[PDB]
Amino acid sequence: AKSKNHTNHNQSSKNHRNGIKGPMPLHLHNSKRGSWLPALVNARRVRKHNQKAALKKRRERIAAFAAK
Amino acid sequence: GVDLTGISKKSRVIRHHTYSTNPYIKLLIKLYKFLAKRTSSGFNKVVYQRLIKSRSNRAPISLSRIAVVMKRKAVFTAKSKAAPIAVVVGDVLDDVRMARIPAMRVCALRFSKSARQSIVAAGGECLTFDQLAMIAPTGKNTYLLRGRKSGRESVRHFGASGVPGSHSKPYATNRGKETKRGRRTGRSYKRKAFRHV
Amino acid sequence: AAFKQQQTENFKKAVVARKAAKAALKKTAYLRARKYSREYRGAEKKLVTLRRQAASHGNYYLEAKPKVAVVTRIRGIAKVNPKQRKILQLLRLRQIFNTVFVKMNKPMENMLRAVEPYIAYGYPSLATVRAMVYKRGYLKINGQRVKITDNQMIKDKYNNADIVCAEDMVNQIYTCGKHFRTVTHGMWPFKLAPPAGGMRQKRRHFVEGGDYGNRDTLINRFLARMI
Amino acid sequence: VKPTVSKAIVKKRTKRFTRHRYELFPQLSSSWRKPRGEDSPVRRRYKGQKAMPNKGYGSDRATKYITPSGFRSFPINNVEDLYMLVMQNRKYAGVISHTVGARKRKAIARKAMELDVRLANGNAKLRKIA
Amino acid sequence: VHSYGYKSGTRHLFAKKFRKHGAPSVSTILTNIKVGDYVDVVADSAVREGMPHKYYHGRTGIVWNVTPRGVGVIINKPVRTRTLRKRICVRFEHVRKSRCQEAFKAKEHQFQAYLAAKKAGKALPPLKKSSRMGGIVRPKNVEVLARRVADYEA
Amino acid sequence: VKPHLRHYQVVGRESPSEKNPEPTVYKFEVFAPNFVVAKSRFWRMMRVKNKVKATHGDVLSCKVVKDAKLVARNYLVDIAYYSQRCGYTRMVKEFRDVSKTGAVSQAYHDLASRHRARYHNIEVLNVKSIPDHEVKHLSIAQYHAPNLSFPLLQRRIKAARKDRAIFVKKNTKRAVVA
RNA sequence: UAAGCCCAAUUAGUGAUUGCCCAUUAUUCCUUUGGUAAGGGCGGAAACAAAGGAGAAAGUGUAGCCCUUCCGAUGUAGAUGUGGCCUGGAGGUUAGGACGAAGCUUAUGGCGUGAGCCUAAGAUGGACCGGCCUCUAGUGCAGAUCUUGGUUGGCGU
RNA sequence: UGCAAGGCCGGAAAGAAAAGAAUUAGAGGCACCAAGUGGGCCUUCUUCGGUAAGCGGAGCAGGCGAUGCGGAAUGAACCGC
RNA sequence: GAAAUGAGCGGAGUAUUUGAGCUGUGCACGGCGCGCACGCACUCUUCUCCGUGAUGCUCCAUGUUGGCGAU
Ligand SMILES: *O[C@H]1[C@H](O)[C@@H](N)[C@@H](O[C@H]2[C@H](O[C@@H]3O[C@H](CO)[C@@H](O[C@H]4O[C@@H](CN)[C@@H](O)[C@H](O)[C@H]4N)[C@H]3O)[C@@H](O)[C@H](N)C[C@@H]2N)O[C@@H]1CO
Ligand SMILES: NC[C@@H]1O[C@H](O[C@H]2[C@@H](O)[C@H](O[C@@H]3[C@@H](O)[C@H](N)C[C@H](N)[C@H]3O[C@H]3O[C@H](CO)[C@@H](O)[C@H](O)[C@H]3N)O[C@@H]2CO)[C@H](N)[C@@H](O)[C@@H]1O
Numbered sequence A: 001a002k003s004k005n006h007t008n009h010n011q012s013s014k015n016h017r018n019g020i021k022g023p024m025p026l027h028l029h030n031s032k033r034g035s036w037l038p039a040l041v042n043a044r045r046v047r048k049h050n051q052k053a054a055l056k057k058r059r060e061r062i063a064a065f066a067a068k
Numbered sequence B: 001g002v003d004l005t006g007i008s009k010k011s012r013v014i015r016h017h018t019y020s021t022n023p024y025i026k027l028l029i030k031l032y033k034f035l036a037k038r039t040s041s042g043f044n045k046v047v048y049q050r051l052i053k054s055r056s057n058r059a060p061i062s063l064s065r066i067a068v069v070m071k072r073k074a075v076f077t078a079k080s081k082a083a084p085i086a087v088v089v090g091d092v093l094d095d096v097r098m099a100r101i102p103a104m105r106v107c108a109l110r111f112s113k114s115a116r117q118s119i120v121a122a123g124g125e126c127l128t129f130d131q132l133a134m135i136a137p138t139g140k141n142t143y144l145l146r147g148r149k150s151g152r153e154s155v156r157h158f159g160a161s162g163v164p165g166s167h168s169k170p171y172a173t174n175r176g177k178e179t180k181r182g183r184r185t186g187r188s189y190k191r192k193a194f195r196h197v
Numbered sequence C: 001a002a003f004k005q006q007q008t009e010n011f012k013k014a015v016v017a018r019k020a021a022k023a024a025l026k027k028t029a030y031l032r033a034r035k036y037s038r039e040y041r042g043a044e045k046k047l048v049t050l051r052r053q054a055a056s057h058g059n060y061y062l063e064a065k066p067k068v069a070v071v072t073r074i075r076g077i078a079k080v081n082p083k084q085r086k087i088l089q090l091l092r093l094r095q096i097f098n099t100v101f102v103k104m105n106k107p108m109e110n111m112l113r114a115v116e117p118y119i120a121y122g123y124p125s126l127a128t129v130r131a132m133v134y135k136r137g138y139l140k141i142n143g144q145r146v147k148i149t150d151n152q153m154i155k156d157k158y159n160n161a162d163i164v165c166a167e168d169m170v171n172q173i174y175t176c177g178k179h180f181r182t183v184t185h186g187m188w189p190f191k192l193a194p195p196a197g198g199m200r201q202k203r204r205h206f207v208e209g210g211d212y213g214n215r216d217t218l219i220n221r222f223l224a225r226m227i
Numbered sequence D: 001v002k003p004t005v006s007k008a009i010v011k012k013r014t015k016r017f018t019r020h021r022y023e024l025f026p027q028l029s030s031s032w033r034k035p036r037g038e039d040s041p042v043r044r045r046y047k048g049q050k051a052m053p054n055k056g057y058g059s060d061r062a063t064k065y066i067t068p069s070g071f072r073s074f075p076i077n078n079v080e081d082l083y084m085l086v087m088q089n090r091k092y093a094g095v096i097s098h099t100v101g102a103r104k105r106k107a108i109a110r111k112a113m114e115l116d117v118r119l120a121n122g123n124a125k126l127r128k129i130a
Numbered sequence E: 001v002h003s004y005g006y007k008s009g010t011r012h013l014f015a016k017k018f019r020k021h022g023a024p025s026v027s028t029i030l031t032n033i034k035v036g037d038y039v040d041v042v043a044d045s046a047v048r049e050g051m052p053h054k055y056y057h058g059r060t061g062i063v064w065n066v067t068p069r070g071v072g073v074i075i076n077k078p079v080r081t082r083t084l085r086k087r088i089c090v091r092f093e094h095v096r097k098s099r100c101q102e103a104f105k106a107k108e109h110q111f112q113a114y115l116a117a118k119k120a121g122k123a124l125p126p127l128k129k130s131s132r133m134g135g136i137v138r139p140k141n142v143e144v145l146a147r148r149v150a151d152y153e154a
Numbered sequence F: 001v002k003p004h005l006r007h008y009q010v011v012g013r014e015s016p017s018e019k020n021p022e023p024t025v026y027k028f029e030v031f032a033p034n035f036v037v038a039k040s041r042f043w044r045m046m047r048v049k050n051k052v053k054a055t056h057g058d059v060l061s062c063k064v065v066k067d068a069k070l071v072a073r074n075y076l077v078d079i080a081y082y083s084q085r086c087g088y089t090r091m092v093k094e095f096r097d098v099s100k101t102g103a104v105s106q107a108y109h110d111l112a113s114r115h116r117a118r119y120h121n122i123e124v125l126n127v128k129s130i131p132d133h134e135v136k137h138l139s140i141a142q143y144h145a146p147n148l149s150f151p152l153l154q155r156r157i158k159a160a161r162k163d164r165a166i167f168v169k170k171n172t173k174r175a176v177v178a
Numbered sequence G: 001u002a003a004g005c006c007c008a009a010u011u012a013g014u015g016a017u018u019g020c021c022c023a024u025u026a027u028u029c030c031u032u033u034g035g036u037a038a039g040g041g042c043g044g045a046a047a048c049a050a051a052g053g054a055g056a057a058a059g060u061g062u063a064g065c066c067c068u069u070c071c072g073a074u075g076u077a078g079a080u081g082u083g084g085c086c087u088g089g090a091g092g093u094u095a096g097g098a099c100g101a102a103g104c105u106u107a108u109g110g111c112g113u114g115a116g117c118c119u120a121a122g123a124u125g126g127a128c129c130g131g132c133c134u135c136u137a138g139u140g141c142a143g144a145u146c147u148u149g150g151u152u153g154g155c156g157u
Numbered sequence H: 001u002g003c004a005a006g007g008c009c010g011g012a013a014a015g016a017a018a019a020g021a022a023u024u025a026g027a028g029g030c031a032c033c034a035a036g037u038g039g040g041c042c043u044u045c046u047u048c049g050g051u052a053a054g055c056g057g058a059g060c061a062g063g064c065g066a067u068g069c070g071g072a073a074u075g076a077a078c079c080g081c
Numbered sequence I: 001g002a003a004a005u006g007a008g009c010g011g012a013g014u015a016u017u018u019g020a021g022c023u024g025u026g027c028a029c030g031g032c033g034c035g036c037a038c039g040c041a042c043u044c045u046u047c048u049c050c051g052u053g054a055u056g057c058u059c060c061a062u063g064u065u066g067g068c069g070a071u
């Protein structure tokens, strides 16, 4: 027949056995998808230059090793 | 009488012995448990602890992967030094997709019949861990590698696959069976391919 | 015997080296414990002078408010609320009659107000510190609880070149110093006996006629029945 | 042989851990069976009840397994098994197996005096003279 | 609360303070919000447009999104055994810039005030002595605390 | 019985603030079992009279007051107590004891019997040794007679804890058991 | 003249501490057992007949490789581990038995924390069977108004 | 030349002073696999329906359930542990 | 006593340097618009020194005085 409807009794004690796992830092999972798109397309233009600068810097770090 | 509430949850699972039945892994565990305590080298610590590990946790490496990371270290090596001895605790497989490779010296726990041939045909050498305990007994001038665990089928099935964000694969023997409701936007909903965090 | 001779010729050097380091540390603990005893006896005379210079002209000497508290846990581990239970963990008071030295600043007093029915605290003397460090003071060496036996084992623990003997630890505890935290986090929580002669009432404050709460230096005679 | 000696045999418990309430039932063996009863007084550890086997009742390992003579016991079946107990002689004692016949116990009991190996169940009359 | 709509139990919560009514002020429009800044979501009725939910009203988090009239802000919400990071998006009137790191940028710039007086010059403000030391008391006034008879007749 | 209360003179003060650069110093007489109780009765009265807390608080002194020569005096222990019905009743209660701290102890033992009031529901005011000709009640004034002379009748002469017995011999100082 | 009620003491205006009685608590001393355990020793130092002795294994787990040290220990439902025990058969090895095997019996002790194992005595039996490593399963009883056989109190009613 | 963004180069860095100015029997972060449970009940305090209830329903915590032991003569749940 | 690690068992001596007194001189403290109750700096009381690795990896074996015990 009738029983107990709703209770919040054990739950806060259950929630702290494996802890309240805290928030994760702001350098993990900082995806910019869904952000304002004119500034998202601009930043892609810049990262495609920063990658070929990184390809050129490492290639320039090798010729500064084969000569020394 | 002590209030040790979250003290069993601080415990971890270590397993100092091996589950393997191989009598030649047990000889390397006889050798590298000796070297792990009797030497301050962190090589023999890691080589002993990775030798205990299971066959799933000793994922194999490919020969074209050894040939690329040894290249990217021999770029900034002075050419008076030779090269490290590549050591993997696991299996080296051949790579069809990389024909010519340098003369590198590889110590693995097992080689293929074809990964052994393409190493020695390039001027190289396949070693073993009793033979690595004699030349560099502490791991001086080595390069310890693992082999890739992502990309496995089992890792690609790990997940819910119908909560948002999850791109895991369903356990389905039929490929064209689970493709309709909850997987197309026309069939009442489609699970969101992206979720923040 | 060609290998075994070089080992005992190297063991011969390590015997005379530990015999030198034993007497070298005997002197710099004899010398350093004399320095502290002059301070404990001389600065105690200074406040007897200032309190007579105060009383002669009708003035008052406000004594310095105590910087060190000794905190023993007097109630067991049953039926404890999770705010009171965490503070008793962060004070390292996890069993009955465990005792810790704490500083007496505002972050620590507002933790001691929150757990008063479970603890009995107060202000220790010099003899309360040195009886707790000598008789029942142990250390956390290699993650293990080992009893203070010689000052070489203390000097091997802290590696501070200021804490080399057992009088250094009763110095930093009694007069706070730069290394109060490293000395007290160096030791294990003190585990005392129950007091001889009894407890009057566990369940009421010291002002109400019972036992918990603050004792404004009366905690020494209560710990002197436990150490 | 005389046995090698050690500290005195403590024996935390000499009473057998018998079954709960076995005396009332002729079926029930005295071998220990653990109570899984939800209202069992032995399982719930009341005051006047039988005890339960536990790791704390275990025996002092320096003196564990040794018999009241001072000897551990090694079961032997023929004469060639006396030859194992020649160096291990003040530690172990021979126990001739039950199914060893009366004819082969002569050959074992002769040599166990020659070779000076204690038998736990043999030639105790002859070891009393010498 | 017998209904589980969006604004339920928000009677006193989405109201405005006494004699503080009106449309938002010009210094809220001119206050420019930048990505990576701590803001402080406080829902402003008299806008009634782009409000946060009632949970995100005392809350304060990091801006991750700036759109022409919107601010995304990452706010921690604990659910069962974990604190996941909710990325809500509000109108710009429902955020205030947060003064949470004010006392940390104060002692940071005090560490370029010092180190600009130690390496080059020598002039420093003196360190403050504790009031918890034991001084002498010169009594300029004494009373007697005694609980007079006439203290009860009130 | 060498009484259970001690006469503490607790001197204290609020604190040197910047609002109040030099605060008022207060004197306080309290009869307490020890000085930890005595300091807290002082900060009870600093709170309910001066809005001063013990957190923002200095105890400048808490010292005992030694008694006197032991002489039979008459003490007016002007004392007040709280009951839930008819709260804060104040009485005067002249007593007859050798010391001032013992006179207040007698007041705490018959505020406990005549009225069932406990330690923390009692405040004690102005304990003073008064002369004989000011004593008003005749149950204390009857001891000022210079020729008192009463007999110790109806006594309980017990043995001296070293020679006490269980069975003595009915007309005899023996001990057949114990 | 409380062994009642409210206060208060601790051997009593004597000279300062803690009247004493009871725990599966506390402190400490032993023993066991398990660790997210932590350290040390393991190249036989020399030497030593009978008429000071034995051990020393590079090791998850044993009758634990041997020592030293530290901490924890209860628990339903539940999970797991066990060179943990037990039964039928199979592959191997090592042995018992007409001088008495299996089975049965027990004021037969021994030892294992325990499941159990082993010895002894039968004034019992009369021909088969043990131990260890592996393999296998119709493999462990106290209760299912459990199944089948027998017996029993009621009752010489 | 400002602004916003992503990098690059160099500098400094009480590794956070002093003012009561923290403490920790504080190894952090991931993942796989799967049980049992999904009838609860009691209590200090807050509280709703009721005249009330050893009644019905909630909140925060602690307990019994699942756990004895020492006490309240006896008592699942109180006191101590 | 099968490594007795000692203010204790040994050697080697007549003293060692801890307090209590009584103090100098600076400073600090306390009052004023000279004090220092002997804080910081440089005669009484007390025993003081040096000693022994493991050439032992581990375990177990050595008192005294009666009572009982003569196969
Ligand atoms: O992979 C996740 C993980 O499964 C989950 N536990 C958690 O990790 C926590 C971490 O929690 C410990 O993780 C251990 C096992 O995963 C566990 O230890 C205990 O586990 C039990 C059985 N698994 C017991 O057998 C035993 O008591 C003990 N080993 C947890 O203590 C916490 O310690 C960290 N503080 C925080 C981690 N988030 O999250 C993982 C994320 O996927
Ligand atoms: N990008 C730098 C390099 O990345 C390497 O790893 C790169 C790849 O090797 C690796 O790709 C692996 C692939 O190897 C393996 N066979 C399958 C696996 N799923 C891939 O993983 C990647 O690819 C899938 C594509 O959707 C992504 O969803 C997934 O997030 C990502 N982990 O992930 C990285 C691709 O961005 C190495 N970590 C290392 O050499 C180096 O850091």
Ligand SMILES: [Mg+2]
Residues within 6 Å of the ligand: none
């Ligand atoms: Mg179970």
Ligand SMILES: [Mg+2]
Residues within 6 Å of the ligand: G138
């Ligand atoms: Mg069956």
